[model samples]
Target: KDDVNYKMHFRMINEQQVEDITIDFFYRPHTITLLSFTIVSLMYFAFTRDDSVPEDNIWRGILSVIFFFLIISVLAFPNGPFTRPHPALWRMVFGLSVLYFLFLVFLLFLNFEQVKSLMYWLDPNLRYATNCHVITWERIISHFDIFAFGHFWGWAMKALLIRSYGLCWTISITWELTELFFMHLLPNFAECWWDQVILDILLCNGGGIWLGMVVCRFLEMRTYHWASFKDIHTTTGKIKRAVLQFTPASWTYVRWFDPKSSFQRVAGVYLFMIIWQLTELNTFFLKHIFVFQASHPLSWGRILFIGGITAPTVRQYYAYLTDTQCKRVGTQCWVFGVIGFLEAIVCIKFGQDLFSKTQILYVVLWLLCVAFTTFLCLYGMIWYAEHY
Candidate 1:
């Protein structure tokens, strides 16, 4: 009897035989489109605008930044590694930036009256300025409600970003205490008991964290099972599927903060919480300097934009925070930090007089609160992780 041996063929594909497919995203706006907008805006302004500088310079500057960000959002905004709200729409936001840039160029050339007229045309609610109220006791109460909860909601976001429930609540409760310490310099920082306890601590922040935690669970468990658009069998199904176009194409599991994590991981998260607090503070500073009511477009727009931007940024930051071998900071983290710092600079530069009057004691106290709360929460989270 004879035994036979089989030999497998060996092959090496040449470099030229291989095809490399990759995406290069350099955030350069379509120059032609930008130029078109600029030209149209120039013509519009030349014909319709008045001769003086507009009164809403702050709005103009902010809008300009939004426009530029939108442009960046198109080309530069990442797909968050997984997907949600679909990356394309962020690109659409970039298109909106193009629109916004043109809009601002038009606004800049216009006198105050024309800009007002344009704003009124866009949002008729602007004309109801008289109906809006400001500078009152009720306003103060409302401010506290916002101060407490915004802190809470923000912490929840930090938790989701860092993926630690303990850190989330820690930041949430600590912010209220921080407000208590800083109420000396910023009167708008003050709030009543119910607003602080019920609305801020439990309702806004608590709810936001709980909701985000739910999302984390979903993402952690989600099977990014992507089926092509053409595969669906029914029209109703297609529409329902179409609806997810606004949702992520896929969900990801981000486990950033673990009890046994190294010091760098721990330090990174703590620093993030502190910087987040600073960003929140920048909002109040901007409002104070600009003399805008809470209900104004300036106010609401900032809130909406920040919230909108944070979604992607948080996701990106999560990836960067946990993936140790990935040496580079995520795109969203860098962008967020840059924007946060720029905003702080803008506030300090424009509000120098106000800053001079700031209670260093209060600021220092807030810093301590941020540090203490951040650490306490992190420690508790570690305990929870161990027990659970």
Candidate 2:
């Protein structure tokens, strides 16, 4: 078994270990220098701040406090799971996700009306959203703008994580069926056949999967080399190279199953699908119960955060599954898995009134269907590997 440090550094959590990969200038932290800079920054803001607001304003204090906490996070937190461009940035991203998860856990203790009341407290604009029964073709077309972009973009990233066309498509199609099963609880699940099959599956989802897979193939073929930014003479060349820093350091081809894969492997893939389905379902349930629209920051922000964290979680999960040397699950994956179920539990606790309306039969049927289909896919993959 690997030591705790190895698991913490490489598997469960992301701590920067490769000093060579990091640039010298900003990667090294000077504690005293940062402390001095922070003291001056706080004192400046404290002295120069104009107290325009009425005395005893909660908003002013909270905003400034959050600002300070973010600065503290940047200065103190470990860069988690990523070091591209800079470790500080990804560390902040990880910190933000943790903040949201803590918020969700806090909300879990509150009842439905209390939760709604809290959201209204935060932003008075919130209300029980009117559920859409049937989406019009024009409205659907217009809605395709950013969300369609997100669909394609999210899948492309998932492809980079999973690196398997078969598994990605399987998860995508399964998710649509997931919506169909729970349309009663979430009216947003209502979609025209054209929307689900043509627009989502063929265009947004399929096109994104194709492009992502193509990107994987391209990266697989390329040799990665980095030269000093000064080596690029043209301004355009330097800017382009700088932009590419945010992308994956290298692409990996993922194989989820093979001829030697036993029933244990089948179980893992099935568990993967279930957990993934629950994660996707959690998104809709959180919005529906919490009275947030799809485009709202609460909705999309959570999506963005989950999407960011999932890249590292899936990478670590793949390693634990396929790599013989990986003794245990990565920290991010473990945390993410717990967060997924906890979100569901939170929904169930706060949305008891909402969940009471669920059709139990449909839930059972969906579970069984998912189990059967996932097994079929896994078995098929194994057979294909054996024969071909």
Query: CA lDDT, every prediction?
Result: 0.58, 0.73
User: Per-residue lDDT of 10-79 in model 2, one digit per residue for the tens?
Assistant: 5333565443443467566787887798789878877987766754356777767766666676776655
Candidate 1 residue 244 C-alpha distance from true site, Å: 1.5
Question: What's each prediction's clash count?
Answer: 5, 3
- TM per candidate comes to 0.65, 0.86
CA shift of 8, model 2, Å: 8.9
Which residue runs of candidate 2 sit more than 4 Å off their true CA positions? 1-13, 19-23, 45-57, 64-81, 131-143, 184-191, 355-358
- Scored by lDDT, the top model is 2
The candidate scoring highest on TM-score is: 2
* Residue 87 displacement in candidate 1 (angstroms): 2.6
